[PDB]
Amino acid sequence: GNRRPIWIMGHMVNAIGQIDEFVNLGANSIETDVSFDDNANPEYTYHGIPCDCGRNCKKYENFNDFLKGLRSATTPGNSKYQEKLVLVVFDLKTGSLYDNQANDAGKKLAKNLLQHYWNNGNNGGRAYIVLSIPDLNHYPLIKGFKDQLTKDGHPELMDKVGHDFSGNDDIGDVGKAYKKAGITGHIWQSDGITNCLPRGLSRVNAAVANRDSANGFINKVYYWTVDKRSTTRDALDAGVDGIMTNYPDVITDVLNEAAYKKKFRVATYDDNPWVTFKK
Numbered sequence: 001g002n003r004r005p006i007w008i009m010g011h012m013v014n015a016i017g018q019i020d021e022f023v024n025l026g027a028n029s030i031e032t033d034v035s036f037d038d039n040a041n042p043e044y045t046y047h048g049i050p051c052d053c054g055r056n057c058k059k060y061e062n063f064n065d066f067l068k069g070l071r072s073a074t075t076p077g078n079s080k081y082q083e084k085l086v087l088v089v090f091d092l093k094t095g096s097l098y099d100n101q102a103n104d105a106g107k108k109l110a111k112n113l114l115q116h117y118w119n120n121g122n123n124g125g126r127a128y129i130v131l132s133i134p135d136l137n138h139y140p141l142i143k144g145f146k147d148q149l150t151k152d153g154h155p156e157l158m159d160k161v162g163h164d165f166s167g168n169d170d171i172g173d174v175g176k177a178y179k180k181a182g183i184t185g186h187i188w189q190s191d192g193i194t195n196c197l198p199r200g201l202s203r204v205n206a207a208v209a210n211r212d213s214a215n216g217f218i219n220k221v222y223y224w225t226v227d228k229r230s231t232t233r234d235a236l237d238a239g240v241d242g243i244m245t246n247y248p249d250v251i252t253d254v255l256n257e258a259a260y261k262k263k264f265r266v267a268t269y270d271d272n273p274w275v276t277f278k279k
């Protein structure tokens, strides 16, 4: 059948200069960490120690600076436009926030994205955005984000926005979280572990099983963080849509192998990241 489109997601892309670095190695997507200040305002694109093996953990920008850089990379006609960069996953580090600030955090995020990424609707960046939340109890962040876009007069930008709960929770628990949030599509399901530690495929298989069942809730599945060819082949054999990596060129090389070229292709802007793939 048709080739499954694959998102090769550059991991921990937190300095503006790293956008080109990862995209030029073959990434069509990037993942970026978002720290929050004491008021639930996004503050930095900062991961900090501990981080993935072989990586500098401390590259960062003021969050709005990174957003303007991301906008340049994703706005057709810009000197720095990268046609290939089509999805951004914001890893919202909401661990520093009280649970009752989750909604506020969503609103502040929407304000920053609207102002600095989507440029108030004036020739904004075109990439699809996944809001990745590490704690199921922070689901009210989603409603906050939405409600803020709506108040600012850009509710249509939600068409470009999707969702992830990244905490490796039980899949049934994740589904219940979405049910509470009233979310019924644009769902990516992360599964993984730092590149420093070994992991099996049981939960990723279960996420794929949910995605491909008639009444499942997951649209796309991604595995993280994968820096090895063997692991890449395993994840692709398992049927994942996305692979998050410190080395996009490693993933690219595997996808360019004759056997894999026949079953997979690098996703482009016209592949809707919210739509479950069918052969």
Ligand SMILES: CCCCCCCCCCCCCCCC(=O)O
Pocket: 039, 040, 041, 104, 107, 108, 111
């Ligand atoms: C919107 C200004 C961002 C800077 C925040 C500094 C003061 C903290 C605000 C408390 C959060 C209440 C949620 C408001 C959402 C909003 O309208 O920004």
Ligand SMILES: CCCCCCCCCCCCCCCC(=O)O
Pocket: 053, 054, 195, 196, 197, 227, 228, 247, 250
């Ligand atoms: C290959 C034997 C098992 C892997 C050992 C765990 C290693 C931690 C993750 C980093 C592995 C990536 C391999 C080198 C990356 C590269 O291609 O430059």
Ligand SMILES: CCCCCCCCCCCCCCCC(=O)O
Pocket: 256, 257, 258, 261
């Ligand atoms: C982009 C070319 C696709 C069609 C190629 C037919 C399959 C043969 C591929 C053999 C592996 C060579 C890897 C080259 C990857 C590339 O740059 O396209």
Ligand SMILES: O=P([O-])([O-])O[C@@H]1[C@H](O)[C@H](O)C(O)[C@H](O)[C@H]1O
Pocket: 012, 031, 033, 047, 051, 052, 091, 132, 166, 167, 190, 191, 192, 194, 224, 225, 244
């Ligand atoms: O893999 P994922 O669940 O999307 O989120 C990632 C992991 O949770 C881990 O914290 C890491 O290295 C990156 O900072 C995050 O992207």
Ligand SMILES: CCCCCCCCCCCCC(=O)O
Pocket: 136, 137, 173, 176, 177, 180
């Ligand atoms: C109703 C019992 C909750 C089932 C588990 C839901 C998963 C996370 C949701 C946290 C919010 C708790 C609540 O108000 O339901």
Ligand SMILES: CCCCCCCCCC(=O)O
Pocket: 050, 051, 052, 053, 194, 196
């Ligand atoms: C829970 C976040 C962990 C990020 C990955 C850090 C790698 C392991 C470091 C350690 O030994 O502690």
Ligand SMILES: CCCCCCCCCC(=O)O
Pocket: 142, 143, 146, 158, 181, 182, 183
């Ligand atoms: C939190 C739900 C976000 C999805 C936004 C798209 C549809 C919203 C329906 C509505 O207008 O209320």
Ligand SMILES: CCCCCCCC(=O)O
Pocket: 258, 259, 262
């Ligand atoms: C480099 C791969 C070339 C295709 C050979 C086998 C084609 C097939 O699947 O029928």
Ligand SMILES: CCCCCCC(=O)O
Pocket: 174, 175, 176, 178, 179, 183, 184, 185, 215, 216, 217
């Ligand atoms: C497609 C609907 C997504 C949210 C519902 C999650 C579930 O199936 O329990």
Ligand SMILES: [Mg+2]
Pocket: 012, 031, 032, 033, 047, 091
């Ligand atoms: Mg991260």
